[PDB]
Amino acid sequence: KGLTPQSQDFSEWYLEVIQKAELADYGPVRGTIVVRPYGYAIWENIQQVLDRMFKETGHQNAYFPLFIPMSFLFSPELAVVTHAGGEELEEPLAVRPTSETVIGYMWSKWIRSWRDLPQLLNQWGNVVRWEMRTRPFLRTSEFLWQEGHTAHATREEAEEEVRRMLSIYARLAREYAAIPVIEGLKTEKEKFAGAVYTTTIEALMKDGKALQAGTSHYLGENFARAFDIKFQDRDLQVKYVHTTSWGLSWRFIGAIIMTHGDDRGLVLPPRLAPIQVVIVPIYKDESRERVLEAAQGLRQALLAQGLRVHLDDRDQHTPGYKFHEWELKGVPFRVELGPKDLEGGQAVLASRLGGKETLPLAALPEALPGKLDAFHEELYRRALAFREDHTRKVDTYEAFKEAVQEGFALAFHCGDKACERLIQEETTATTRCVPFEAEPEEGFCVRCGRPSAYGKRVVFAKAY
Amino acid sequence: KGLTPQSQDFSEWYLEVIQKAELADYGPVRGTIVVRPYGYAIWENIQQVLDRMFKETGHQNAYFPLFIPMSFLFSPELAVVTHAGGEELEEPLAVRPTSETVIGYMWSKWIRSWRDLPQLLNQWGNVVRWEMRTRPFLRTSEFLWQEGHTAHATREEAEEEVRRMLSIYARLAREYAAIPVIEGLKTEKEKFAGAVYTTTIEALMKDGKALQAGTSHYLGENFARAFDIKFQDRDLQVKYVHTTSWGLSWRFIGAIIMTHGDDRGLVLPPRLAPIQVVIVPIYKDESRERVLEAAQGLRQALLAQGLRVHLDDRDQHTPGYKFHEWELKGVPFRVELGPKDLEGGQAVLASRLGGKETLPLAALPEALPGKLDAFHEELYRRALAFREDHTRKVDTYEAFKEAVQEGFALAFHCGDKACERLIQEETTATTRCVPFEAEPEEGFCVRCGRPSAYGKRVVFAKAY
Numbered sequence: 001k002g003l004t005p006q007s008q009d010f011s012e013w014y015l016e017v018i019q020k021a022e023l024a025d026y027g028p029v030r031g032t033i034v035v036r037p038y039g040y041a042i043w044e045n046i047q048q049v050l051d052r053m054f055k056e057t058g059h060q061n062a063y064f065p066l067f068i069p070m071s072f073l074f075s076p077e078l079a080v081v082t083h084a085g086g087e088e089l090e091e092p093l094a095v096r097p098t099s100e101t102v103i104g105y106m107w108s109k110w111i112r113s114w115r116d117l118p119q120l121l122n123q124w125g126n127v128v129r130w131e132m133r134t135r136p137f138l139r140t141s142e143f144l145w146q147e148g149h150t151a152h153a154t155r156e157e158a159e160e161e162v163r164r165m166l167s168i169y170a171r172l173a174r175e176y177a178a179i180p181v182i183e184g185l186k187t188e189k190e191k192f193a194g195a196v197y198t199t200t201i202e203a204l205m206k207d208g209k210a211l212q213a214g215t216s217h218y219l220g221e222n223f224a225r226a227f228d229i230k231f232q233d234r235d236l237q238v239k240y241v242h243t244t245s246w247g248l249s250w251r252f253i254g255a256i257i258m259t260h261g262d263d264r265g266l267v268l269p270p271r272l273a274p275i276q277v278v279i280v281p282i283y284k285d286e287s288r289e290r291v292l293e294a295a296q297g298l299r300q301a302l303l304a305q306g307l308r309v310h311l312d313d314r315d316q317h318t319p320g321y322k323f324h325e326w327e328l329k330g331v332p333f334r335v336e337l338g339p340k341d342l343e344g345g346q347a348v349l350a351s352r353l354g355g356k357e358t359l360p361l362a363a364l365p366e367a368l369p370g371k372l373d374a375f376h377e378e379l380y381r382r383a384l385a386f387r388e389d390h391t392r393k394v395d396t397y398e399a400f401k402e403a404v405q406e407g408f409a410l411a412f413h414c415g416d417k418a419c420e421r422l423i424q425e426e427t428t429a430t431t432r433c434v435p436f437e438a439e440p441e442e443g444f445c446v447r448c449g450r451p452s453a454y455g456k457r458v459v460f461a462k463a464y
Numbered sequence: 465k466g467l468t469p470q471s472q473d474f475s476e477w478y479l480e481v482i483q484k485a486e487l488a489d490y491g492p493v494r495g496t497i498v499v500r501p502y503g504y505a506i507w508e509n510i511q512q513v514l515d516r517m518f519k520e521t522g523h524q525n526a527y528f529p530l531f532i533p534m535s536f537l538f539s540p541e542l543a544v545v546t547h548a549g550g551e552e553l554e555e556p557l558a559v560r561p562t563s564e565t566v567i568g569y570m571w572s573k574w575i576r577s578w579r580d581l582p583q584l585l586n587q588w589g590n591v592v593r594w595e596m597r598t599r600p601f602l603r604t605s606e607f608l609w610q611e612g613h614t615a616h617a618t619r620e621e622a623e624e625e626v627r628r629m630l631s632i633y634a635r636l637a638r639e640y641a642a643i644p645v646i647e648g649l650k651t652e653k654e655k656f657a658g659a660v661y662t663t664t665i666e667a668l669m670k671d672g673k674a675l676q677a678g679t680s681h682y683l684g685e686n687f688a689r690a691f692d693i694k695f696q697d698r699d700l701q702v703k704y705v706h707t708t709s710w711g712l713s714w715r716f717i718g719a720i721i722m723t724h725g726d727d728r729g730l731v732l733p734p735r736l737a738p739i740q741v742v743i744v745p746i747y748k749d750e751s752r753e754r755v756l757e758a759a760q761g762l763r764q765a766l767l768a769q770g771l772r773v774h775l776d777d778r779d780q781h782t783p784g785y786k787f788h789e790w791e792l793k794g795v796p797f798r799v800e801l802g803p804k805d806l807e808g809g810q811a812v813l814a815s816r817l818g819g820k821e822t823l824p825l826a827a828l829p830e831a832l833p834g835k836l837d838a839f840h841e842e843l844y845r846r847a848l849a850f851r852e853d854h855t856r857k858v859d860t861y862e863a864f865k866e867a868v869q870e871g872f873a874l875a876f877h878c879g880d881k882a883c884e885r886l887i888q889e890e891t892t893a894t895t896r897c898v899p900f901e902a903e904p905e906e907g908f909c910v911r912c913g914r915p916s917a918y919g920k921r922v923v924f925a926k927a928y
């Protein structure tokens with residue numbers, strides 16, 4: 001049964017492609033998924049890219065415990081261990097929803113003077129925050145992610161870190177996933193309760209809904225006061241540190257799926273694709289030797305170019321099967337190398353985006369790199385256009401209701417939480433972010449008509 | 465004050481070095497630890513090396529859920545979740561002690577014919593096996609590791625996979641950690657219960673006790689039958705798959721500490737050491753510019769050589785302090801770069817293995833790589849010498865009791881589980897493995913006297 005078209009039922013389309021492209025599958029325990037190889041490889045590329053960016057910026061990876069003192073934290077989001085070692089634990093243990101509490105404790109003892117700062121920490125791994133609504137890569141009790149935490153001697157240095165990390169996520173989205181995003185502040189209502197403020201990158205999925213792709217919080221001294229994290233400054237005065245926190249999960253994979261995916265399956269951005277180019281040799285007993293030899297030569301030639309190429313010479317499947325599979329899995333480029341074309345020293349180069357062409361094998365190594373970039377460029381261009389066509393300035397609550405039905409709605413807002421929640425209660429739409437950079441404007445709240453706040457229009461939308 | 469000497473109290477020396485070298489610290493939960501950046505970096509290196517080796521052999525990474533249905537398995541080793549989402553669960557969940565059961569379940573559905581074979585999976589991550597003791601990188605309820613799982617169409621292909629992965633573990637040990645190991649089979653008593661047989665690599669620590677560094681099991685059809693994992697072969701006949709299993713945890717880090725460490729602290733193998741060379745610039749105000757410029761020049765030159773070099777320009781610590789820290793942390797080489805020697809175009813190269821030599825700065829970059837290799841070779845050589853000195857062939861149960869007090873005891877054994885458990889109850893020593901490459905010998909059980917089995921002497925020792 002072919003893939004349900006996006007125009008017919010996006011939600012179902014989403015669930016089916018994750019299944020058909022073999023990204024994930026449902027685990028025995030309700031609410032849990034099994035991330036398959038192909039899907040995991042996408043997460044690995046995302047991790048490698050972020051890790052380099054984190055490292056170049058001084059952060060270091062560490063590993064805080066999976067089990068957290070219940071005393072240090074009953075709460076619906078927690079999965080609690082009550083039995084272990086063949087007995088009831090006098091002290092039940094919570095599975096970490098995040099490592100912040102343990103981090104705060106360790107920082108309390110590790111940080112003593114300005115010499116101990118900054119503290120630039122990151123951790124890759126799983127966390128658990130119980131969820132009733134199951135949905136692959138979007139909402140699951142357990143998921144993988146990366147959460148960073150930093151401590152600084154001054155406020156300035158911390159706020160700079162906050163933006164530094166958000167820009168890293170924005171770069172990941174733009175330069176690597178070709179996903180357009182808006183950088184800005186969450187409103188008081190939408191921010192993390194414990195942060196002075198929360199910055200975010202908001203993306204628009206092909207179904208017109210918004211998805212938060214990354215977050216970076218400025219915690220001020222809130223976290224430091226809570227865990228008694230202080231240091232002796234150069235002026236001998238004892239002060240609390242200024243901290244930040246930022247995370248990005250495999251929800252990003254969902255963002256990639258719903259941003260570039262089409263009715264034929266996945267379309268992965270070249271710079272995060274586990275396989276940028278797949279070679280599918282076609283032959284018969286007679287032409288086996290010649291074809292595979294040429295297929296392998298091309299494989300090496302592409303590897304030498306630093307490209308992630310895969311030679312699918314599997315005997316357990318037919319060419320028709322392979323082509324269909326690699327299409328579903330969104331491989332940017334496919335190379336059909338058959339006996340006939342091979343005589344002419346050529347092969348067929350197909351683009352997941354559409355179109356094919358016969359070219360000489362020798363020219364392929366030198367051309368693919370530029371083509372991959374072009375492929376990336378096209379994905380971004382198309383995504384930008386979609387966003388443009390699905391973003392609308394609104395001055396009336398009537399036009400607002402129409403706008404949040406198709407995508408982004410740029411509207412004035414009074415800045416009142418109550419007015420903001422009312423809009424959500426009536427339209428289900430939420431404020432996604434007050435962008436850092438946008439046309440400066442002054443007006444009146446799209447809902448209550450009172451003077452507009454923020455000095456610009458706020459981005460609203462129905463969100464994931 | 466120094467570290468408790470190894471000969472004074474090995475165990476206390478162990479805990480102290482981990483603490484002092486900042487490999488790990490203690491978390492709020494009695495039993496949970498925190499792996500610091502320097503300690504984590506070692507694991508990251510082990511992971512990269514193993515990952516490359518698994519990848520080149522066709523394996524692929526995946527991610528199975530943390531929680532497993534209790535029905536798939538309260539055994540004291542298990543940590544059980546009975547409360548989640550603010551409510552008490554009807555079906556108690558187990559935190560994975562291994563993903564084997566969920567993998568078996570998924571394979572049951574994914575595997576249908578020969579086209580789905582072979583299955584070559586691996587997973588990096590945490591698992592939990594309750595431990596009352598708490599020794600970082602040796603015995604902890606929660607730990608990180610890698611566990612591989614494969615499904616094959618034939619017994620021959622499965623058994624080959626088993627030895628392929630053991631050899632990979634042996635290569636990591638020998639070629640990367642400079643840790644000598646003995647490859648062999650576990651006895652029936654020591655093998656994994658659900659396995660036809662268990663292979664392993666056994667290392668000897670500096671305290672004369674043996675340590676299982678890694679294992680690879682041939683599960684035959686036991687696993688397939690238990691989880692109903694079968695396939696339609698080319699001959700249209702439905703058959704059970706043959707599976708293998710293999711794992712290696714950061715316990716491997718403890719092996720490194722106890723194999724090469726000394727009274728001065730850690731001694732990291734060059735090929736796994738986060739920092740292979742550390743540059744310590746010594747200077748004054750009038751020579752600060754010249755030195756640092758020379759240091760940075762050497763830094764770059766070494767990086768250009770592909771070496772993991774670190775420049776410790778921290779001006780808040782005396783050169784002595786630095787020398788001590790990098791020695792404690794086991795950095796292979798330390799370059800002392802000062803005013804006087806620099807004028808001569810030279811610097812002092814200090815080896816963690818002992819000794820110094822003044823060499824021309826210009827020749828260093830080209831020489832270090834080869835020196836690191838010799839350093840590695842020396843580490844291995846010493847460990848081999850140690851093993852030879854702590855290994856002894858015994859023909860009497862008297863000589864056996866002496867040998868297993870110092871290290872390895874090469875004795876004949878009848879092969880009876882009963883006799884084997886007796887030797888353990890009487891000496892605490894266990895069989896480590898029946899070595900693959902062991903001189904063929906026939907004799908009589910070192911304890912009961914009955915005719916010897918295995919056609920060779922069995923390795924015995926007190927073990928971790």
Ligand SMILES: [Zn+2]
Pocket residue numbers: 413414415416419420445446447448449450
């Ligand atoms: Zn209003």
Ligand SMILES: [Zn+2]
Pocket residue numbers: 877878879880883884909910911912913914
């Ligand atoms: Zn016996």
